[PDB]
Structures are given as C-alpha cells and as structure tokens.
Write a protein that binds this ligand. Structure first.
Ligand SMILES: Nc1ncnc2c1ncn2[C@@H]1O[C@H](CSCC[C@H](N)C(=O)O)[C@@H](O)[C@H]1O
Ligand SMILES: [Zn+2]
Ligand SMILES: [Zn+2]
Ligand SMILES: [Zn+2]
Lengths: 247, 14
C-alpha cells in the first residue's frame, strides 16, 4: 500500500482510506509550525537579467550568502520571484510517497531519483516548551503510543508532530541513512528540514539517523536492516526526560 | 517512568 502527497489534502476521503488500511491514521496537516506558546537579512547576489533567467542560470544558488548560512531569502530578495533559496516557504518539496513498511509502520520513499543535498520536506509540528513537553510525554505514555514524533529544535523548543504535522513525520530511522536534518532560519525563526546526503534512487525508502535520546524504560528494536545496525532506537543509554527534552 | 519514548536530535550527517 502507498499514497501520494495530494491524498492527504482531503480529510474525509483520507479518513475513509485509512479505515480500509490504504492510508495511515489521520492527523492534522499543517503548512508551518504552530507554537503552543508564542516566544519573544538580504543577500548580496546580483540580480539575474531576463536573458540569464531564460538561459537557465540559477538565482541565489551555491554562492548565495544566505543559502551558505542556511538562511532563506524573503520576498525582498534582489532576485525576487526567481530566488531559488525560498524552498521551505514555497513548499518546494521532493517527489515522495508514503508507504507501508513490513514492521516500522508507515514510511517515506522517493518517487523520482533525488540528487544529493535535495530538500525533501520540513519537519513541521506543534512547538512545545519544557513544561508542555512533559505534559505530552505523560499523555502519550498513558495512551500507550507506539510511534514517537518529538524533534529537538532549540533550547526550549521541541517540535511535536504527533497530532499536527506533515508527511515528514513518516521518515523512519536508519543506522546507515540517506537523509539528514538541517536547521534553517526562515523569517528570523528556526526550522528543521530533511535533506538527502547522497543520490537516492527512485523507489528507495528515505531515512535519517534519529540520534534518538531515549527516556523510556525500554528501547525499541531497530529494523533498519543495515550491516552496522545499532540494534535499538536510543542505542545503549537511557536518558532522563529532562535531558531528552534539552535540559 | 514511561515504558517507551524519546526525542529525535538533529545533527549533520557524518
Ligand atoms: N528503524 C526503525 N526500526 C523500528 N521502528 C522504527 C524505525 N524507524 C522508525 N520506527 C518507528 O517509527 C516511529 C518514528 S515516527 C516514523 C513514522 C512511523 N513509522 C509511523 O508509522 O507513523 C518510531 O517510534 C518507531 O516506532
Ligand atoms: Zn542570494
Ligand atoms: Zn534570494
Ligand atoms: Zn538500525
């Protein structure tokens, strides 16, 4: 079973497909992070001429000062509409499908060949502070959830994609992955996105190394299948809830 | 003491 990203745009049809095992369980699809508690930059690229645009030159490419510092451009970029460094904002995500794996739950797979260092998807969710994080830890333990969706963003910001997020919440862990996190500044705010680290052939599952900070009493077994698998999500050590959440 | 759970930690792939 597999589905494409447009299948998640219609909640009623999605909920029906989920009841027949054709889509994962319903969640609230969001376009950007939602803060439970709200908290308290133009590059120097020379604008492309119309002829350079027509000949295929890239605006705000590899030499863009903002891109080099993992900062996206705004609407006021000197290249305006042509700026290629607004991928998070313009939802310029990779062509990926959501698939059912044999025993990891649902996962993500490439629907085309993905070049190295291709933006896949932003990891969106509800952003929690430490107090809200502990409340959700308790709730998900009481609910006996199997899958966990917490991503550390910065000191007192944990992204929780359990209830609200996007298809990035389906990326599974691998001990030998083909994607990574990158933290990007968008409008003075930090976001996390997934990016390939190598050429990913069409049909391949997309994975990243969770570097999981496990507070649970027991670690989940890892089924990534890599020759150098660590055996468990969390590895050897158990950490406290407070350390896992950024202390 | 939850039986299961943890937090994913961003890092640059090495
Ligand atoms: N390599 C792996 N081995 C076993 N389970 C994995 C795994 N990678 C991800 N998972 C499962 O997926 C959870 C992370 S959320 C990833 C999406 C999830 N598979 C889903 O169906 O919604 C983990 O807590 C674990 O339960
Ligand atoms: Zn630029
Ligand atoms: Zn730009
Ligand atoms: Zn593994």
């Amino acid at each position: 079973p597999s589905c494409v990203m447009d299948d998640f745009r219609d909640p009623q049809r999605w909920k029906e497909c989920a009841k027949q095992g054709k889509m994962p369980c319903y969640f609230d699809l969001i376009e950007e992070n939602v803060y439970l508690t709200e908290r308290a930059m133009q590059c120097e690229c020379t604008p492309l001429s119309k002829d350079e645009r027509a000949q295929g030159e890239i605006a705000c490419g590899e030499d863009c000062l903002n891109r080099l510092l993992m900062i996206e451009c705004s609407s006021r970029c000197p290249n305006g509409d042509y700026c290629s460094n607004r991928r998070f904002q313009r939802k310029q995500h990779a062509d990926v499908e959501v698939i059912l794996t044999e025993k990891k739950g649902w996962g993500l797979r490439a629907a085309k060949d993905l070049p190295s260092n291709t933006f896949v998807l932003e990891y969106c969710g509800e952003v929690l502070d430490h107090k809200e994080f502990k409340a959700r830890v308790k709730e998900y333990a009481r609910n006996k959830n199997i899958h966990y969706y917490f991503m550390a963003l910065k000191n007192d910001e944990i992204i929780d994609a359990t209830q609200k997020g996007n298809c990035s919440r389906f990326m599974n862990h691998s001990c030998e992955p083909n994607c990574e996190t990158q933290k990007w500044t968008v409008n003075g705010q930090l976001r996390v996105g997934f990016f390939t680290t190598k050429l990913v052939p069409s049909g391949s599952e997309l994975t990243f190394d969770y570097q999981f900070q496990r507070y649970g009493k027991e670690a989940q077994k890892c089924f990534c299948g890599s020759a150098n698998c660590r055996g468990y999500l969390g590895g050897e050590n158990r950490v406290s809830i407070r350390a896992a959440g950024g202390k | 003491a939850p039986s299961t759970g943890g937090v994913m930690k961003p890092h640059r792939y090495r």
